[PDB]
């Protein structure tokens, strides 16, 4: 193909009824949204925005899309027996951790290209260096 259809998917309609546990809980969430759907989000928002999107190929597949360098970047997240990792050297246990971790470790370490780390989520960033340590957990 080597092409990219056009779309906006602009429509605010919440016809849900108290949805159970879901990525929503996190300040950042992204459904099956397509490329354009993510780009526009990190394109219109402030420089350094990010989010978590899932792939169609494998239900159990996530991706971190962040806007940087006048361009929207994306990363393919892996999943092993309920695990999460984007590199062979580094490996995490949960998606949340992988995210709350990058905020401290510049993606430049792994993705030399991206000389920046998660600055702001999809919904809203954090304040007062708020974080939740993992005591004997993980």
């Amino acid at each position: 193909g080597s092409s990219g259809s056009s779309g906006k998917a602009e429509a605010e309609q919440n016809w849900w009824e108290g949805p159970p546990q879901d990525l929503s809980v996190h300040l950042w969430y992204a459904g099956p949204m397509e490329r354009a759907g993510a780009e526009s989000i990190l394109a219109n928002r402030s420089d350094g925005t990010f989010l978590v999107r899932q792939r169609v190929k494998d239900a159990a597949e996530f991706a971190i899309s962040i806007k940087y360098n006048v361009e929207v970047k994306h990363i393919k997240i892996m999943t092993a027996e309920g695990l999460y990792r984007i590199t062979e050297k580094k490996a995490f246990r949960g998606l949340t951790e992988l995210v709350e971790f990058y905020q401290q470790n510049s993606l430049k370490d792994c993705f030399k290209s991206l000389d920046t780390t998660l600055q702001f989520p999809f919904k809203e960033p954090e304040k007062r260096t708020i974080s939740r340590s993992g005591p004997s957990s993980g």
Binding site: I75, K76, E88, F111, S113
Partner: peptide, 15 residues
């Protein structure tokens, strides 16, 4: 083929 780099690539230089 087998290889697939649709997304960003990790540190290449660093073997």
């Amino acid at each position: 083929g087998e290889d697939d780099g649709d997304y960003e690539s990790p540190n290449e230089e660093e073997e």
